[PDB]
Structure formats: C-alpha cells, structure tokens
C-alpha cells in the first residue's frame, strides 16, 4: 500500500520538503517540513507574516495541554512554544491516527520561510536530541508504538518546484535502481554515520578520516547543502576551484554569497568534479561509496532579472558542528532510515538528475581498514 505515499512530498528549491498532515479534531490541515536533523514535532500556532494558516488549539476537542514550555535552536532558525498533545494523521501516509507531542510555536526567529508553503516541522530523529529533553517522545516513536507501522521510513527527494516521496513504514522498490547499500547508524540521536574516505574526481583527499566526521556526520533532509567541517571544506573548495580554474567566479561564490551564471544551455558541467563519499559498511573492513555530480552541489537559482542565463549557487558550505549530508546529497538517491536494524541505506534514485557523460552512483563493496578510527570521540 506504499503507492499511496509515492509523490507525497512537495516544496520549493532550497526551502525544504513538506508532507501534508492533519492535527486536532476536527482535523486541521497543515504542511509539515520533513526534518531528519531534529526530533521535535512543531507547528505555527500563532499569526505570522509568513504563515498562511496555523494550528488552532482552541478549535480542537482532542487537544491536551502539557503545561510546559519548549525552545528549539537549529543551525539556522529557532522557535519557542507550548507543549501539548493532540491527534495526528498523514492523509497520504498510513491509514492511522496517533496522539503525539506537539509544540505550538508562539515565537520564532528566522525559522519560517516566506513562500515555502509549510507551517510546521516534523523532527524524525531520536529522543536523545528532543527538547526540552529526551522524555518528550518524538512523533515517529509514537507512531511505531501506537500502530502497526514498521519501524522504518524512506525518503526519495527529487530536486529540479521540487517533489519526492516519504514512504512511511517500508521500502518501495519501484523508486530506485540497483542495490541498496547500508551504513550503520553510529548512535541513536541524530542519524549519525561515519565517512571513511573522500575522493574528488577519483583522487583521495588524503586527510585523517576523523576530520571527515570531526565532531559528527549526520544525514539531514532539513539542510539544503552539503556542510563540511572547516578543514574538510577548505580542501574540497581548493580541489573544486583547481578543477574549474578555466572559469571566473566572484569568489563570494565559493562562500555561497554570490551566484554564477552562464548563457542558457552552456553550463560547463564537465569542468566541475564529482565527489565520492565512502561510508562505513555492514561487514568488517567493508565500505561503499556514493558519488555526487556537480549538478547536485551547484543548486539552480532563477535570475529574477534577465532570465536569459542559467545561474547557480555553490551548495557546499563550511560547518563547525560536523558534516551534514543535506538535500544536495540525498536528492541523488533513495534513502532508507532503517531504525529497526540501526542502519541507513542508499540506492540510486529513479528521479536522479544525471548529466550526459557521468552518472551518480552507489557502489560497493570496497575494502577499508580501521574504519572505526574514523569516528570522532
């Protein structure tokens, strides 16, 4: 019955993917952003210039107040509100209803996005990072505990205004090609994984692999870019710069502060390198790799002015809180969050965006010694 969930995600490029949900009785319809980078379910519950609608507790007969405040800070954006519970369901998801924790957003800062079309957020990670603390059971945990929905979900994010699928409770084989490759969820808080090697156009960056996970490495559908720790970010940009030297860039471009353009249909993709991220595998000394095409880290940005050229923004940015594999990475694949078996699977997506002479891929197996040493402690 997964076909009913295919194509249940929508969104605007760079503004997150959202799924439709209903909260309260009678059911209140809202678009909720899917965030594997957090664990709190929250919805705008008070007027806001960027919100077209919001959760109205006074109109729901099943709403229960928990009489507790809550605040949640993200890499960018934050909100605070009032905790409570209410009945929730997903129209284009499993046919079930569950009572879950809901944070009614009363105040926010740089959280809601103008014209994004979503009014709430669904944190799909674990209770360990839930606010105010791990006692606030996350939505998916509640779903799994109250219903017969298996403990896993998969995300198929399709880039270029964007669409995709969140298959709740299973894997839909019609959405990917080739084999699924699994990497262990290191610890159950963020969906933390371990990167064991990085190559750019087939050349190893040759850094201590701990640097790749310096602090941590997570998979986050709620982050647009591929975010890399300082040292790693610098090595990558240096490499990407050198490979594309035969072109001129505003330099602010490499910081994501300025976009580059080219005459329509003349983008020199061939000069931008593919990036291969090797992830720890399921067996001893075994890993696999996923390769990223420049069409993924060069996010298209429409030019409101003279819509004659194709412009793009560099979607790889520096981080101080570890590596973040955002939409830039996920859009190229079918990603399975197999909580039950504590692993995350990757497979080439059916909606992959491949160029003409190169192909995004998930390949294995590779042999890699001392992978455990790649994890930061």
Ligand X SMILES: CCCCNC(=O)[C@H](C)C[C@H](O)[C@@H]1C[C@H](C)CCCCCCCC(=O)N[C@@H](C)C(=O)N1
Catalytic residues: 220
Alpha-carbon distance 229 to 234, whole Å?
9
* Minimal distance, residue 133 CB to ligand X, in Å: 11
In the complex, the smallest distance separating the C-beta of residue 253 from ligand X, rounded to whole angstroms, is 18
Query: Nearer to ligand X by C-beta: 121 or 311?
Result: 121
Beta partners for residue 263, in sequence order: 309
With respect to ligand X, which residue has the nearer C-beta, 183 or 217? 217
**Whole-number minimum distance, CB 55 to ligand X, in Å?**
17
Query: 238 Cβ partners below 8 Å, 6+ apart?
Result: none
3-state secondary structure of 16: coil
Our CB check for ligand X shows the closer of 72 and 279 to be 72
Please identify, using beta-carbon distances, which residue of 42 and 149 lies nearer to ligand X. 42
Neighbours of 280 (CB within 10 A): 25
- Burial (CB < 10 A; 0-12, 13-18, 19+), residue 294, is buried
Minimal distance, residue 232 CB to ligand X, in Å: 17
How far is residue 264's CA from residue 256's CA, in Å, rounded to a whole number?
21
CB-CB contact of 40 with 132 (8 Å): no
Which residue has its beta carbon closest to ligand X? Answer: 222
CB of residue 29 to ligand X, shortest distance in Å: 20
The CB density around residue 337, as the number of other CB atoms within 10 Å, is 22
- The residue (of 136 and 311) whose beta carbon lies closer to ligand X is 136
The rounded distance, in Å, linking the Cα atoms of 70 and 73 is 10
> d(Cα 107, Cα 48) in Å, to the nearest integer?
9
Q: Which is nearer to ligand X, 139 or 181 (CB)?
A: 139
**15 within 8 A of 113, measured Cβ to Cβ:** yes
Other CB atoms within 10 Å distance of the CB of residue 153: 25
Cβ atoms of residues 108 and 77 within 8 Å: yes
Spatial CA neighbour of 217 closest among 37, 39, 338, 40: 37
User: CB of residue 236 vs ligand X: minimum separation in angstroms?
Assistant: 18
Q: How far apart are CA 266 and CA 102, in angstroms?
A: 48
Q: In angstroms, give the least distance from the CB of 76 to ligand X.
A: 4
Residues within the interface to ligand X (CB under 6 A):
15-16, 33, 35, 37-38, 72, 74-77, 111, 121, 129, 131, 220, 222-225, 324
Measured from the CB atom, the residue of 216 and 343 that comes closer to ligand X is 216
Angle among Cα 158, 227, 225 to the nearest 5 degrees reads 30
Query: Residue 191 gets which letter from DSSP?
Result: B
């Amino acid at each position: 019955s997964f076909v009913e969930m295919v194509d249940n995600l929508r969104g605007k490029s760079g503004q997150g993917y959202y799924v439709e949900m209903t909260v309260g009785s009678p059911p209140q319809t809202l678009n909720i952003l899917v965030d594997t980078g957090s664990s709190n379910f929250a919805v705008g519950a008070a007027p806001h210039p960027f919100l077209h609608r919001y959760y109205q507790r006074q109109l729901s007969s099943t709403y229960r107040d928990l009489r507790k405040g809550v605040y949640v800070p993200y890499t960018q954006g934050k909100w605070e509100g009032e905790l409570g519970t209410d009945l929730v369901s997903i129209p284009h998801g499993p046919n079930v209803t569950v009572r879950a924790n809901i944070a009614a957003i009363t105040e926010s800062d740089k959280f809601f996005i103008n014209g994004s079309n979503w009014e709430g957020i669904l944190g799909l990670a674990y209770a360990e990072i839930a606010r105010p603390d791990d006692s606030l059971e996350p939505f998916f945990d509640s779903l799994v505990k109250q219903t017969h929905v298996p403990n896993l979900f998969s995300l198929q994010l399709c880039g270029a205004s964007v669409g995709g699928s969140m298959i709740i409770g299973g894997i839909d084989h019609s959405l990917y090609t080739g084999s699924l490759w699994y990497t262990p969820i290191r610890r159950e808080w963020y969906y933390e994984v371990i990167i064991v090697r990085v190559e750019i156009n087939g050349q190893d960056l040759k850094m201590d692999c701990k640097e790749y996970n310096y602090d941590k490495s997570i998979v986050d559908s709620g982050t647009t870019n591929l975010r890399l720790p300082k040292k790693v970010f610098e090595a990558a940009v240096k490499s990407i710069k050198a490979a594309s030297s035969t072109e001129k860039f505003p330099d602010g471009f490499w910081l994501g502060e300025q976009l580059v353009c080219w005459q329509a249909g003349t983008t020199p993709w061939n000069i931008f390198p593919v990036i291969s991220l090797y992830l720890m595998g399921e067996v001893t000394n075994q890993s696999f790799r996923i390769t990223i095409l420049p069409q993924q880290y060069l996010r298209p940005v429409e030019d409101v002015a003279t819509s004659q050229d194709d412009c793009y923004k560099f979607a790889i940015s520096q981080s101080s809180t570890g590596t973040v594999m955002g939409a830039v990475i996920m859009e190229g694949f079918y990603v399975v969050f197999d909580r039950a078996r504590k692993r995350i699977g990757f497979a080439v997506s059916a909606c992959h965006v491949h160029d003409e002479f190169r192909t995004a891929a998930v390949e294995g197996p590779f042999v890699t010694l001392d992978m455990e040493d790649c994890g930061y402690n």
